Amino acid sequence: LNIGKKLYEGKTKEVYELLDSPGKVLLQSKDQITAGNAARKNHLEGKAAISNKITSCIFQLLQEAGIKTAFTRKCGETAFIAPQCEMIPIEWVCRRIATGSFLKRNPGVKEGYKFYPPKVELFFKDDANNDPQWSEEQLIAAKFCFAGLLIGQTEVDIMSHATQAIFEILEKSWLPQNCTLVDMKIEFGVDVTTKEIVLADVIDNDSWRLWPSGDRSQQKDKQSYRDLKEVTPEGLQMVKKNFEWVAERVELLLKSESQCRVVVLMGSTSDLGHCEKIKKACGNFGIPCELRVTSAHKGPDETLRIKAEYEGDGIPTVFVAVAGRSNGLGPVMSGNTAYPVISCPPLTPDWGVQDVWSSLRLPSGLGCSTVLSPEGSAQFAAQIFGLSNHLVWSKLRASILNTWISLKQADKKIRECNL
Amino acid sequence: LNIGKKLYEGKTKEVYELLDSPGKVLLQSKDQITAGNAARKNHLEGKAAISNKITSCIFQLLQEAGIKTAFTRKCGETAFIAPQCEMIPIEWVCRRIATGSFLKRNPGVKEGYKFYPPKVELFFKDDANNDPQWSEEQLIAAKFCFAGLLIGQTEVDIMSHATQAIFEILEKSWLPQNCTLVDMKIEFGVDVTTKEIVLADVIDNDSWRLWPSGDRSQQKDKQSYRDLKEVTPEGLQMVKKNFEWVAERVELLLKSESQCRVVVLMGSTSDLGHCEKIKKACGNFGIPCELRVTSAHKGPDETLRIKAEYEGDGIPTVFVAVAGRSNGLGPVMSGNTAYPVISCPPLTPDWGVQDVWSSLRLPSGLGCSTVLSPEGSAQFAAQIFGLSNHLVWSKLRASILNTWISLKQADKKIRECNL
Amino acid sequence: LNIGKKLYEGKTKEVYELLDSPGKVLLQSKDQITAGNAARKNHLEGKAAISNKITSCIFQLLQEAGIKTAFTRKCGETAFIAPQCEMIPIEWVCRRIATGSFLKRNPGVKEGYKFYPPKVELFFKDDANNDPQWSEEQLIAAKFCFAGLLIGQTEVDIMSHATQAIFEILEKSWLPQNCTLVDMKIEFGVDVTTKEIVLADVIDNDSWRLWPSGDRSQQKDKQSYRDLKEVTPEGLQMVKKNFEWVAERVELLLKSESQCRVVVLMGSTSDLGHCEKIKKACGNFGIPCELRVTSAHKGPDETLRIKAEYEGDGIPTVFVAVAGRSNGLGPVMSGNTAYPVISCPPLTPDWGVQDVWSSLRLPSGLGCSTVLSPEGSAQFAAQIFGLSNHLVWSKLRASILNTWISLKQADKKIRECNL
Numbered sequence A, B, C: 001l002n003i004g005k006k007l008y009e010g011k012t013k014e015v016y017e018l019l020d021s022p023g024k025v026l027l028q029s030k031d032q033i034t035a036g037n038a039a040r041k042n043h044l045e046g047k048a049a050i051s052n053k054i055t056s057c058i059f060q061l062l063q064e065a066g067i068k069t070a071f072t073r074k075c076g077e078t079a080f081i082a083p084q085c086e087m088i089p090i091e092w093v094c095r096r097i098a099t100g101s102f103l104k105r106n107p108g109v110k111e112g113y114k115f116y117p118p119k120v121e122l123f124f125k126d127d128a129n130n131d132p133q134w135s136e137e138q139l140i141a142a143k144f145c146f147a148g149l150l151i152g153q154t155e156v157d158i159m160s161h162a163t164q165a166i167f168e169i170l171e172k173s174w175l176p177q178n179c180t181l182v183d184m185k186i187e188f189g190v191d192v193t194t195k196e197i198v199l200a201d202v203i204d205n206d207s208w209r210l211w212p213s214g215d216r217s218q219q220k221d222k223q224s225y226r227d228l229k230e231v232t233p234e235g236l237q238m239v240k241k242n243f244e245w246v247a248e249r250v251e252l253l254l255k256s257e258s259q260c261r262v263v264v265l266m267g268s269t270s271d272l273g274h275c276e277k278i279k280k281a282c283g284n285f286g287i288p289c290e291l292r293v294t295s296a297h298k299g300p301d302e303t304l305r306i307k308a309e310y311e312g313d314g315i316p317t318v319f320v321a322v323a324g325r326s327n328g329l330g331p332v333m334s335g336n337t338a339y340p341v342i343s344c345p346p347l348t349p350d351w352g353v354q355d356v357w358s359s360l361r362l363p364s365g366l367g368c369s370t371v372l373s374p375e376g377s378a379q380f381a382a383q384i385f386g387l388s389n390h391l392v393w394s395k396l397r398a399s400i401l402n403t404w405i406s407l408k409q410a411d412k413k414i415r416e417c418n419l
């Protein structure tokens, strides 16, 4: 591994140029912990490895959800390879529960106040002035330029929405450990290669506030260090065990907590092209999806036997019924299974106006729903698994973000058609 | 507790009439354990209390799902009150994994063969002829009678179908304990009061096969007693600990393992009647359901803020969007939430044919589904929570059964209009 | 007729290879009769000729209905040519009336109990273990192989369903002779050439139970031989006369007992392509089908005169009215004939949604039905002649089966796209 020159040395991490790989970069964590611009610089054994481990688990989690992130891979216990970024010197803060600074900047508001939606706040990176809060108006007006991307209305709006989505995803991801994610800081930079704005720096035990069972007294984050009346050698052991607790538990944010399956039933082999598209779309959400051929009209006894195969192996399953014309497959399925059924009929414009009403009007005692879009029927099935699988949810949540960013970009481009 | 005469003394339980309650009955468990028509019978301390405890939790669970079951309330440590039944002398068996007698009567079938759907079998009650298997043809031909109900085509079909649902519900209910329900036996009787066929006798540690982590060697049911080459005092201790293990865990089957919530959003207060039908229907499935008033057209900033309130407290949530005319509320909800959205528009015959296409045709990036029935929209919301909540699932599964039974009876009634 | 080596010698027939025909086979009947694994075996003059004769008429009939059956052509008095099969060692039994072993294995069931649908049972082939009944579970678990086809879920389900259709066809086919088919046994094999599962072995007077006027005491099948407390020379004469009686009547099952005709009326010669599809489809069911050109709008006096021509020669007739636009031809036909009328308008996606209501809404006094599919209109015409012509019925019944088999295979194929 071909180390280059030191591009930045921070209190807890160094960034190197990678001579062997053009426009990539190595972030080395150090065995260092700190509190503000105070005198807490304190060497801590194994901290480097814990910090690197967390940012790698989080960045991979966020990346596999579809958040645009500056991360390629881990490089040993204490560093990682990422595309080179020109950092935007703004600390972006998201908070579900008012605490810390929000109390001092909003006297009257009590510890525990809930923000719906999660609150976003901007802080300019200055220690000489102790990180002062900025309005979106201040950042737009500062006309900052980084790797030749001017930070204007569109880029600030995008980072703001992204901070919220990133927080929501990490919050959702920690929930199955009965851990309340209270708040967090992230930094965005510009990928010098692509010129995309991407999550950068790190996200580790310094970056957030983590309360098991929502109990502040069991705080596992760096707050435990910042709170110590006086830092003793014995006092740093508690702090380290808190860090160890997280590092051992973060690897389970990447673990699926629920099995998900779609079963597409098609009435005819000539529907296969339509069903391929559903399988593909389920693919994009990381949901196993099986195709099967059965007719309620010509083989209803097997429609029930096939139903039973997937009903009875204990795996949580959504059925998607693909039948054109008189869709008798959706009704029979809906009426004889406790698991959800989505009719997704392969309507063409010729008889689509007439055949949709075979899917929509069923005698009650049937909860059969309708979704025309084949990618839609996957996405809906995902939304359903999203209630019980944080990985599926995170993919859906990020999808919303990126679809919104996509419109912001399209609008900026075509806005120039008016100048 | 005014005890009457003794109506039945079995090997492990007695049935008494209650002088002070007409057509009710006390089932007393005994401290007794048995296997076959051999001399394998044993006193066992605490067994009476354990057996009664289980039948009480299982019957409450089956009853709260909506299975017609002969159970009033537990009556101390070791008995329970039930409506009087004339017992039908058939042991109904349902299996999900071939073992035991299925292998002896089907040489060639390997221990572990999975039944899809679950296999149902009849055995006629006789310690004399060693409990011989019977066919539906044999039970129909028997022309049996109980509390004036002739057991014909319709009643046998009903008990057969019922055995499958009761198995499925108890199988699903044990799943969150890592416990594979392998098989079970239940007995049905006729409630002398109603003339309904109802689950009766008991369901306890004698009645089923229970494998923790699907491992036969960890079997916690009576099989562990049946299997002893010799019954020793140390051997009966293992058996008792097995029973104790179950009795500790049986209560947890009644406990909801996940939070469920529907949020109905309505555009106008004049939709409230429609929304109340959905709230009631959610009630029927035991899902908490909130109404809110918000318009996409007139107050979209609020629609999103309200959305955020339910998204942010981490309770799994189905949104149901009630908007007539140009449903703009379902789209805007669907496009800005990871959680499922069901449009349930209050369509009338006048403009319903035209307004439904505002719900059905959406741009991609949206997983909005459509369900016209207001009862249906709750049922669909149930199906969704059914994947991750065994109590909701049990209510859906039972509902299917009873709706099937209801058709079977009505067909019998109107079949007399053919004479 | 170049005989080869002897591939099998059974109790009543031998199978030879044919040296001059690759993958074909000669089945030779013998002048032999047998019952059980006892010493009941007897020479019987003319039996070979009678048995061969029946299997030939039955197989031709089943084959002409569209059942996949191993039969090429009769080869003299006492043999027939068939494709080579690896026989599957299961006797498949179908019953319409409980008798014989069904009563011995189901004590309590009275001789005469009717099965709806007809009952199917498996028996594994062994004179050793006295032909023991097997369950579908046992045959699947056997992992049997024949001509490289593994007998699994799909193949067992196919043979099971097939046994029912083959029974139904032969039951319906004997009905016009006042003969109740009580039950039957068939064997299936794998055609070594095609790898298809096909009806094989034989179906003769040994294979079924035949009761003239539903009277067991007039039984004409082998049962009359099985039942003899003692076999005497005078006793074998009765048995032989029973066999002769069947062999005289078996040919008449191939004979159409009623005349069938479809008359397609078309308004315009430019509809002819549509009308040809109906004519072909009538062909497929062996129903003679005539085209005629007549307009209700432009030549109603002729429409009636043509109608009169088919009404007057006393051949049972379905009219199929092909008129696009303002179907006036179906109404005027329907209103002026006792014979059924099916409107089959050549609707296109452009104006089909609007023109269908000229076919559907008629004043009372008219029994005009509507069938959009041109294939379907022939099929419906078949269903109608199916009530009064056993050959047409057999083709409809078989069609159902093969369409079911076709789904079963295609599901198996596409099920591999799940691995």
Ligand SMILES: CN(C)CCCS(=O)(=O)N1CCN(c2ccc(Br)c(NC(=O)c3coc(N)n3)c2)CC1
Residues within 6 Å of the ligand: A007, A008, A015, A025, A027, A070, A071, A082, A083, A084, A085, A086, A087, A189, A199, A200, A201, A202
């Ligand atoms: C005016 N311009 C063109 C001159 C460039 C100055 S520099 O090349 O030397 N520059 C490199 C990036 N630096 C930097 C400084 C501090 C940090 Br942190 C990071 N972080 C990342 O690069 C990163 C990428 O991905 C992730 N997760 N982090 C980068 C800061 C110094």
Ligand SMILES: CN(C)CCCS(=O)(=O)N1CCN(c2ccc(Br)c(NC(=O)c3coc(N)n3)c2)CC1
Residues within 6 Å of the ligand: B007, B008, B015, B025, B027, B070, B071, B082, B083, B084, B085, B086, B087, B189, B199, B200, B201, B202
């Ligand atoms: C004289 N004729 C009309 C017959 C009367 C004899 S009896 O009526 O007195 N007698 C028999 C045993 N029976 C019996 C025998 C054995 C049993 Br177990 C049960 N179980 C139940 O009744 C029951 C209902 O609900 C529940 N959970 N159990 C009943 C029911 C009572």
Ligand SMILES: CN(C)CCCS(=O)(=O)N1CCN(c2ccc(Br)c(NC(=O)c3coc(N)n3)c2)CC1
Residues within 6 Å of the ligand: C007, C008, C015, C025, C027, C070, C071, C082, C083, C084, C085, C086, C087, C189, C199, C200, C201, C202
């Ligand atoms: C060496 N291996 C691959 C086995 C070969 C032994 S064999 O192939 O020579 N042999 C066995 C008996 N078989 C057999 C044995 C008994 C019978 Br019956 C039938 N019947 C039919 O083949 C058949 C097909 O169609 C009809 N109507 N019959 C076949 C088929 C031939």
Ligand SMILES: Nc1c(C(=O)N[C@@H](CC(=O)O)C(=O)O)ncn1[C@@H]1O[C@H](COP(=O)(O)O)[C@@H](O)[C@H]1O
Residues within 6 Å of the ligand: A011, A034, A035, A036, A037, A091, A093, A099, A100, A101, A102, A183, A184, A185, A206, A207, A208, A209, A222, A226
């Ligand atoms: N971790 C940091 C930092 C930060 O720079 N922290 C270090 C400073 C350093 O690393 O040099 C410190 O605590 O002294 N700033 C914000 N946050 C996080 O942001 C949210 C805001 O909290 P608030 O500042 O309002 O209390 C909470 O999660 C912080 O931990």
Ligand SMILES: Nc1c(C(=O)N[C@@H](CC(=O)O)C(=O)O)ncn1[C@@H]1O[C@H](COP(=O)(O)O)[C@@H](O)[C@H]1O
Residues within 6 Å of the ligand: B011, B012, B033, B034, B035, B036, B037, B091, B093, B099, B100, B101, B102, B183, B184, B185, B206, B207, B208, B209, B222
């Ligand atoms: N508990 C019983 C009984 C049964 O009668 N048990 C006791 C009677 C008593 O003491 O109350 C006995 O005599 O062993 N019969 C079937 N089953 C259950 O049925 C399923 C089928 O197993 P199989 O019929 O294969 O043995 C498995 O769950 C058995 O435990």
Ligand SMILES: Nc1c(C(=O)N[C@@H](CC(=O)O)C(=O)O)ncn1[C@@H]1O[C@H](COP(=O)(O)O)[C@@H](O)[C@H]1O
Residues within 6 Å of the ligand: C011, C012, C033, C034, C035, C036, C037, C091, C093, C099, C100, C101, C102, C183, C184, C185, C206, C207, C208, C209, C222
């Ligand atoms: N013909 C046969 C056979 C059978 O193997 N017959 C012969 C064998 C031979 O000589 O070729 C015998 O050994 O009796 N087995 C069943 N069936 C028919 O099956 C239905 C069922 O009757 P059940 O199985 O109740 O006896 C009824 O039609 C029998 O004739």
